[PDB]
């Protein structure tokens, strides 16, 4: 219980910042996650033997895909750690515990393909889960790993608390379905602006936690320009593979996913920043003012993508 993780000084300091990059050393990422748990939650939240064994089972069930991989999992967990640390009195003990685990597990066993591709392929998961297909699978894989012998990091919780935390994780992971994001943010926008938003209302908390999950999940748009620019190559590599597989089914993919139309990437990016990312961090900043650095960094990067379109770089 007196065993803390420490990081080297540059990491110890930079990890507190929203725009932190977890680096290219895979073997430090589990330590980075435990560090964040111990500062965000407490050193008693989880039994270290169980946490370490949960983390390495989760890692093992991320696939070697260009973007939706173990590095994404830990990156999205760090963004949630930054939001929680900057807003530390707004969230319960259970929410701090649940949300970091939810972010680490939110893309478990992702294959690099969208819910639409699974559906057009007629993948078995699409018959099992008619909506939020991959996201119901991610939650399912989470529960699977929790029920492995020695992996139940929630074993010290009461019956009620256990059921609450699994319900926090389920809604948190389902909210990473971008199809649900548009309506969720619209409702929050309305609630904030008419003054009706109330964080003691569980259905309002749910929506706000949903928006936090979207903000963490898209946090690659909030990094320093060189990180954001290079992450775009990994995202587009999955898009083009999915476009290829669409063509193999006899379906012309949208232009964003067609590797024969790579000149129309910079404009595909702009639409995504204006329709999804900017509104997401704007509404989030309105509800959680300390999350403003995410909105500012997102705007800085939109400005960098506009430059790329003009041929200024
Ligand atoms: C994986 C789909 C969701 C997603 N997450 C991120 C971080 C991005 C992103 N960022 S970047 C680093 O600037 O390329 N660009 C995207 C462009 C289009 C798009 O259409 C769905 N999604 C994008 N996206
Ligand atoms: Mg996902
Ligand atoms: Zn994700």
UniProtKB/Swiss-Prot annotation:
The name on file for this protein is cAMP and cAMP-inhibited cGMP 3',5'-cyclic phosphodiesterase 10A
Note the superkingdom of the native organism. Eukaryota
Subunit-level organization: Homodimer.
- Keyword annotations of the record: Allosteric enzyme, cAMP, cAMP-binding, cGMP, cGMP-binding, Cytoplasm, Disease variant, Hydrolase, Metal-binding, Nucleotide-binding, Phosphoprotein, Repeat
Q: Which gene encodes it?
A: PDE10A
Specify which residues bind a divalent metal cation 2 according to the UniProt entry for this protein. 107
PDEase domain residues: 1-312
List ligand-binding residues for 3',5'-cyclic GMP.
Answer: 68, 269
Active site, renumbered: 68 (proton donor)
Q: Which residues bind 3',5'-cyclic AMP?
A: 68, 269
Residues that coordinate or bind a divalent metal cation 1: 72, 106-107, 217
Annotated organism of origin: Homo sapiens
